[PDB]
Amino acid sequence: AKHRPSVVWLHNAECGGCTEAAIRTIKPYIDALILDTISLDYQETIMAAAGEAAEAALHQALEGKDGYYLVVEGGLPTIDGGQWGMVAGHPMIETTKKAAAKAKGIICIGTCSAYGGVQKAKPNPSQAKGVSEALGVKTINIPGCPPNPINFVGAVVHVLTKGIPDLDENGRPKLFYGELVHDNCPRLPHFEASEFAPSFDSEEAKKGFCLYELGCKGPVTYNNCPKVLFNQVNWPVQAGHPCLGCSEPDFWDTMTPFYEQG
Amino acid sequence: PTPQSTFTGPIVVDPITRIEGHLRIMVEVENGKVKDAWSSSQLFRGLEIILKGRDPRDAQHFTQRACGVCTYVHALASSRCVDDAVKVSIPANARMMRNLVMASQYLHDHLVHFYHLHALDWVDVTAALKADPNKAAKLAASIAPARPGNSAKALKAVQDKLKAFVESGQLGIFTNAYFLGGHKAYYLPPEVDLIATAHYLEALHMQVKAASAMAILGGKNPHTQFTVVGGCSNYQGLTKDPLANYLALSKEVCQFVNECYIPDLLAVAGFYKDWGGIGGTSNYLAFGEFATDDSSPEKHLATSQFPSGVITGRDLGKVDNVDLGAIYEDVKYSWYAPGGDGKHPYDGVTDPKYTKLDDKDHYSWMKAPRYKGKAMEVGPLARTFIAYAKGQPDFKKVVDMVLGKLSVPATALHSTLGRTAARGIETAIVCANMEKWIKEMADSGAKDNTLCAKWEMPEESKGVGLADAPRGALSHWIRIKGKKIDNFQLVVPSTWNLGPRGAQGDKSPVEEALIGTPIADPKRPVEILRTVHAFDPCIACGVH
Numbered sequence: 001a002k003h004r005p006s007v008v009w010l011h012n013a014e015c016g017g018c019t020e021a022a023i024r025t026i027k028p029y030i031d032a033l034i035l036d037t038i039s040l041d042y043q044e045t046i047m048a049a050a051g052e053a054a055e056a057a058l059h060q061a062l063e064g065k066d067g068y069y070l071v072v073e074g075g076l077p078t079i080d081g082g083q084w085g086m087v088a089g090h091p092m093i094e095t096t097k098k099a100a101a102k103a104k105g106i107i108c109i110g111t112c113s114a115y116g117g118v119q120k121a122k123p124n125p126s127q128a129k130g131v132s133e134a135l136g137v138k139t140i141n142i143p144g145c146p147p148n149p150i151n152f153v154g155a156v157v158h159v160l161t162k163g164i165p166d167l168d169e170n171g172r173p174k175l176f177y178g179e180l181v182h183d184n185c186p187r188l189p190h191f192e193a194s195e196f197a198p199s200f201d202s203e204e205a206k207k208g209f210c211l212y213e214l215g216c217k218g219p220v221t222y223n224n225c226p227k228v229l230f231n232q233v234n235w236p237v238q239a240g241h242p243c244l245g246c247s248e249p250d251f252w253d254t255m256t257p258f259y260e261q262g
Numbered sequence: 263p264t265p266q267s268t269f270t271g272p273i274v275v276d277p278i279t280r281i282e283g284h285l286r287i288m289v290e291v292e293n294g295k296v297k298d299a300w301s302s303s304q305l306f307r308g309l310e311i312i313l314k315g316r317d318p319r320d321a322q323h324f325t326q327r328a329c330g331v332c333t334y335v336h337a338l339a340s341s342r343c344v345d346d347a348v349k350v351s352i353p354a355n356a357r358m359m360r361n362l363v364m365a366s367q368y369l370h371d372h373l374v375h376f377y378h379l380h381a382l383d384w385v386d387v388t389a390a391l392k393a394d395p396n397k398a399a400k401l402a403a404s405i406a407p408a409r410p411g412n413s414a415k416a417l418k419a420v421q422d423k424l425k426a427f428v429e430s431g432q433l434g435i436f437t438n439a440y441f442l443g444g445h446k447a448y449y450l451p452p453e454v455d456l457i458a459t460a461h462y463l464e465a466l467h468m469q470v471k472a473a474s475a476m477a478i479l480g481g482k483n484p485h486t487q488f489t490v491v492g493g494c495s496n497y498q499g500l501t502k503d504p505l506a507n508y509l510a511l512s513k514e515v516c517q518f519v520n521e522c523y524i525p526d527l528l529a530v531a532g533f534y535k536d537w538g539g540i541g542g543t544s545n546y547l548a549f550g551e552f553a554t555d556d557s558s559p560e561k562h563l564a565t566s567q568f569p570s571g572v573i574t575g576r577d578l579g580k581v582d583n584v585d586l587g588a589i590y591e592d593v594k595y596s597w598y599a600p601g602g603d604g605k606h607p608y609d610g611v612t613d614p615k616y617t618k619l620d621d622k623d624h625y626s627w628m629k630a631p632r633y634k635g636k637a638m639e640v641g642p643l644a645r646t647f648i649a650y651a652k653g654q655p656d657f658k659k660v661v662d663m664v665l666g667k668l669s670v671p672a673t674a675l676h677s678t679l680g681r682t683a684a685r686g687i688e689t690a691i692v693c694a695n696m697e698k699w700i701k702e703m704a705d706s707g708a709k710d711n712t713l714c715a716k717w718e719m720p721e722e723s724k725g726v727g728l729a730d731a732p733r734g735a736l737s738h739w740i741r742i743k744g745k746k747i748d749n750f751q752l753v754v755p756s757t758w759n760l761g762p763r764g765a766q767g768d769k770s771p772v773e774e775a776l777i778g779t780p781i782a783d784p785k786r787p788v789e790i791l792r793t794v795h796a797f798d799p800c801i802a803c804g805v806h
């Protein structure tokens with residue numbers, strides 16, 4: 001019985017799309033991962049235990065002799081002493097702080113935990129923050145809304161088996177986030193030739209012209225979408241839609257209007 | 263007999279796990295039965311506030327982030343909404359593509375809910391270690407269709423993996439499970455636990471295929487990106503080779519629904535037949551889904567192949583039409599400012615005001631949606647009753663089937679067991695329809711590949727987008743002023759189901775369903791979870 005590294009996964013201000021994205025991994029599948037690779041010791045979406053029993057499972061993991069790695073999904077709502085976001089009667093900011101204190105490493109899955117995300121968008125009624133900002137601690141960021149499971153699992157496996165991957169200025173591993181979406185887009189030749197769709201109904205759109213005039217943020221977005229695809233089959237520009245810039249910090253405010261470049 | 267303790271006193275379960283989002287459940291218990299209940303949503307994000315003043319075209323991208331479990335459905339609702347506000351009629355191909363993506367979402371979402379969210383309330387995974395895999399194989403061979411995954415050898419490998427995992431001492435997501443050590447409320451034979459655990463693992467793989475199928479049309483999953491005002495952007499979604507692969511994947515998923523999901527669900531139902539008497543409510547609402555004419559919200563309501571309607575007081579003889587003018591939301595018992603009660607969603611107000619934990623006067627971040635003063639249950643059960651009542655041929659066939667298999671009357675469906683069975687029933691029906699719907703779109707797409715219509719942004723307008731998402735009646739409501747979002751309101755299926763009391767002090771569906779719940783063991787109150795989970799709760803959705 002080889003010991004499997006303990007992973008604690010917290011849900012804060014999230015939509016669950018990151019947990020969903022994670023379970024779409026096929027290298028390995030999620031069953032192989034939690035049966036052979038890691039010991040996933042707290043995960044609200046799928047754990048058997050509930051209530052006090054779940055809280056005790058969390059505390060057992062946090063007190064584990066072998067330590068643990070922390071995965072955080074979602075931003076942290078900080079207005080009113082953090083009371084607008086609570087689990088087991090405790091502000092999410094308090095519990096995340098406690099769990100971060102002794103973590104071997106923190107992986108922020110998704111743009112929300114990395115940078116604050118959707119609830120941080122103006123006027124930010126819950127005064128939500130990304131984890132690094134709220135806790136003042138260093139995070140490995142795996143952003144996108146949600147990130148590809150390839151990026152999340154690859155980072156988890158890299159951290160357990162080698163160490164911290166090389167990160168860019170926004171804390172994203174360069175293994176996945178080193179290249180612009182646009183530099184790998186199959187419609188680049190159209191961009192270069194100034195062959196743009198003026199609308200989604202146009203013959204240009206039907207011919208698969210570049211989506212830049214329709215708001216495509218691929219030229220300012222670092223992600224590996226066109227290279228690795230999603231779900232082994234597709235990606236947004238291949239489905240004829242512009243990139244929203246969803247792996248960029250604060251994209252809700254910097255990349256909008258999504259259908260414009262202004 | 264149904265196990266029940268003598269416990270008198272409060273029970274709080276927070277967090278409710280195996281749902282999306284953050285839910286606290288408080289109950290008062292007397293002689294081992296729930297006598298009062300509160301459904302307390304514990305996170306606010308405030309998408310409605312965030313949308314104010316933004317581009318109506320942006321709405322769907324924000325609102326899709328209401329939730330990633332029921333991914334897509336909010337982008338769809340927002341697109342239908344803005345489509346209605348600009349008065350654009352989407353092309354035939356866009357209607358078909360949008361409805362096919364919804365269908366794919368039903369299959370993914372329901373499969374994952376039954377196995378990965380709900381099953382652990384009924385299946386004692388550790389008891390599966392006690393089964394003889396040979397006896398388990400014969401059992402499965404006798405009830406369900408024949409399949410290699412149900413052989414002695416496949417079931418033994420599953421049992422071998424589980425045993426090595428349990429003996430490692432790192433139980434992971436099973437740590438402190440309510441079934442550890444046995445539990446009076448868990449009735450399944452060990453062989454059945456093994457079979458269901460095998461399929462639980464299988465389903466982890468099959469849900470990947472269901473999401474791949476969806477992504478062929480949707481761009482990616484989670485969070486699709488193929489819908490635009492006026493229709494869809496995905497021209498490749500209409501061509502032959504992708505639709506052939508879409509079909510092929512949906513067929514694999516549907517084989518698994520028919521070989522594993524439905525047979526497991528029926529086995530569980532057979533053993534927990536007493537749960538046909540627990541967790542019933544009386545009123546049902548649906549906006550319908552899978553319309554042949556989505557030119558307007560009126561037409562969606564009228565032509566939804568899974569029909570729309572309102573049943574009141576369990577009266578299956580009187581399905582009324584949906585009056586969209588009669589929907590409103592109260593906040594009396596919610597964490598919002600005073601004076602926000604009785605608001606139609608076009609006049610919706612979202613002014614957060616927190617008080618404190620377990621304040622019986624204000625205890626949820628969900629608003630309380632009401633229909634003419636009545637709470638409404640939404641979701642698979644609501645759709646199933648409405649479809650059955652109206653004589654929808656597929657729903658009449660599969661329902662009467664399920665009822666005959668189980669030897670229970672149609673009245674047993676007003677229950678937690680009913681609610682659970684309804685979810686399977688409609689999955690089987692979506693599956694039976696997939697090939698016809700795919701063929702329709704393939705044929706249409708080859709003849710003419712129009713996918714988006716032209717449209718103009720009006721200075722001032724309003725619109726509504728309706729869908730029946732996997733959890734029920736979803737509506738997005740926009741007021742446009744100066745070509746911008748003046749007001750944008752979501753009223754979500756889990757808001758209908760799991761909101762708090764309305765302004766008259768009246769329990770929401772989940773709160774009412776909880777009354778009369780037996781508690782065999784107040785330390786491990788799995789019965790609360792069986793009823794809550796059967797609603798397929800989503801607090802991210804409910805509160806937004």
Ligand code: SF4
Pocket residue numbers: 013014015016017018073074109110111112113117118144145146147327330
């Ligand atoms: S990053 Fe996007 S998909 Fe992940 S939790 Fe945040 S909103 Fe949901």
Ligand code: SF4
Pocket residue numbers: 181182183185186187188189191209210211212216217218219237242243
């Ligand atoms: S569609 Fe977007 S990512 Fe692709 S070439 Fe055009 S601007 Fe670049």
Ligand code: FCO
Pocket residue numbers: 329332335336731732733734736754755756757799800803804
């Ligand atoms: N289904 C679903 Fe999500 C909820 N409740 C939505 O809409």
Ligand code: F3S
Pocket residue numbers: 144145181221222223225235236237242243244245246247
């Ligand atoms: S929207 Fe996000 S998923 Fe990729 S294509 Fe653009 S970075």
Ligand SMILES: [Mg+2]
Pocket residue numbers: 437438439
């Ligand atoms: Mg224990």
Ligand SMILES: [Mg+2]
Pocket residue numbers: 310629751752753754805806
């Ligand atoms: Mg709302």
Ligand code: NI
Pocket residue numbers: 282328329330331332333800802803
């Ligand atoms: Ni949801």
